[PDB]
Design a protein around this ligand. Structure first.
Ligand SMILES: *[C@@H]1O[C@H](CO)[C@@H](O[C@@H]2O[C@H](CO)[C@@H](O)[C@H](O)[C@H]2NC(C)=O)[C@H](O)[C@H]1NC(C)=O
Ligand SMILES: *[C@@H]1O[C@H](CO)[C@@H](O)[C@H](O)[C@H]1NC(C)=O
Ligand SMILES: *[C@@H]1O[C@H](CO)[C@@H](O)[C@H](O)[C@H]1NC(C)=O
Ligand SMILES: [Zn+2]
Ligand SMILES: [Zn+2]
Length: 379
């Protein structure tokens, strides 16, 4: 019987939510398993780029999903979260569900995880759901766990995705404790539903489960706005992505666009593509535009009519507010161990190890995850 792994993401689960709200079900999951208190994720700290990093072990410049909205000038193709089904956009890397699927006598399964409804290098998971945000968590849970438990050839890798607490974190902002506590209580209940379901099917003792997320959330404010329309005319550039990392494609002399934008607000950094800080690993890809604007934490780049959004993410990946957490339980994981931090790109080599897959070249460090694993030396 080959090892099995369920990877679960609750979108937008800021690491310090664990310290500020009560998660009885998640804490029960943790006490018989492992917790990484905060994971250093990848810039830019958006949903599609970070989910792909988890399943590839790659920085965004390397796997090619550099934002939730992209434009490739050469092919003229556009990407958005809904318009995300052209394999072109995913083919710069090979995600773990593909490597798993290519093994004889093994299958992959998916319930709503970004990209899992797209054939990547001509490979699609045996079981997958076409993205549909209306599908309940119960349906996602029941189908994913039934697939893991039944199925032949056996399902050895599975993904499970949920849109909260990201959606409501944007709505209320993470500083709204009254409303966020209700949001997060529901997430904790869903975690309880996951555990109860695993136990009922007798998967709980033998399935490896990772519960994690893609990024956190920080508070935005009408006192912290940078209006591009106040700084530069529309006719000078095309806006590929807006806030808090604006992707700017100049229509005229780049130097002219740069000179206006660099004198717009002290609350953002304005970079020529070739000046983007090395620490971001966000330069070496044609999908990165000639100029990017990076707003300081809690600042929002707007146009004249841009809607209010009390919470946001996308900021510098060194900010604690942007970091998710990771927890895990199962035969491969220690019981009751807690660790400060790992990098989000380390999850991939760890998962390949648990599953006995050959990892593709990546940016992760397996060593960072050894203390989580029963078969490994913990220095
Ligand atoms: C992250 O890992 C990737 C994968 O090995 C590295 O990308 C490779 O880099 C070399 C030279 O830069 C190329 O020959 C390969 O074709 C690249 N592969 C891919 C998939 O891009 C990348 O350099 C690593 N990043 C860092 C910062 O170390
Ligand atoms: C999305 O899911 C809901 C719930 O299953 C369903 O009623 C609806 O028809 C789905 N939409 C599409 C376009 O499949
Ligand atoms: C959930 O499983 C049922 C039963 O196998 C299936 O008919 C249904 O389409 C699944 N829901 C999806 C794929 O969203
Ligand atoms: Zn997200
Ligand atoms: Zn979001």
């Amino acid at each position: 019987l080959p090892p099995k792994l369920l990877l679960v993401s609750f979108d937008g689960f800021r690491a310090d939510y664990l310290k500020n709200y009560e998660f009885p079900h998640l804490q029960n999951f943790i006490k018989e398993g492992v917790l990484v208190e905060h994971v250093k994720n990848v810039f830019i700290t958006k949903t599609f780029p970070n989910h792909y990093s988890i399943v590839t072990g790659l920085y965004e410049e390397s796997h090619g999903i550099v934002a939730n909205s992209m434009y490739d000038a050469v092919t003229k193709k556009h990407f958005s979260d809904s318009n995300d089904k052209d394999p072109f956009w995913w083919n710069e890397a090979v995600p773990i569900w593909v490597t798993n699927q290519l093994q004889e006598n093994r299958s992959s399964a998916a319930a709503m995880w970004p990209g899992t409804d797209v054939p990547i290098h001509d490979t699609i998971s045996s079981y997958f759901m076409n993205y549909n945000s209306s599908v309940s968590f119960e349906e996602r849970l029941n189908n994913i766990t039934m697939w893991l438990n039944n199925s032949n050839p056996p399902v050895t890798f599975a993904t499970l995705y949920w849109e909260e607490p990201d959606a409501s974190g944007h709505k209320y902002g993470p500083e709204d404790k009254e409303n966020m506590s209700r949001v997060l209580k529901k997430i904790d209940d869903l975690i309880g539903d996951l555990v109860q379901r695993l136990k009922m099917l007798g998967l709980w003792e033998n399935l490896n489960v990772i519960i994690t997320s893609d990024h956190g959330m920080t508070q935005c404010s009408q006192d912290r706005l940078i209006n591009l329309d106040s700084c530069i005319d529309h006719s000078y550039y095309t806006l590929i992505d807006l806030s808090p990392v604006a992707a700017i494609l100049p229509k005229i002399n780049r130097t002219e666009v740069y000179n206006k934008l660099k004198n717009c607000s002290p609350h953002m950094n304005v970079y020529l593509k070739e000046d983007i800080p090395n620490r971001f690993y966000y330069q070496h890809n044609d999908r990165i535009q000639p100029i990017i604007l990076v707003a300081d934490e809690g600042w929002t780049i707007v146009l004249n009519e841009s809607s209010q959004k009390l919470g946001d993410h996308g900021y510098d990946n060194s900010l604690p507010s942007m970091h998710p957490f990771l927890a895990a339980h199962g035969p491969a994981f220690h019981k009751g161990y807690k660790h400060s931090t790992i990098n989000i790109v380390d999850i991939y080599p760890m998962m390949c190890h648990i599953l006995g897959l050959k990892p593709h070249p990546n940016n992760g460090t397996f060593g960072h995850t050894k203390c989580l694993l029963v078969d490994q030396w913990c220095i």
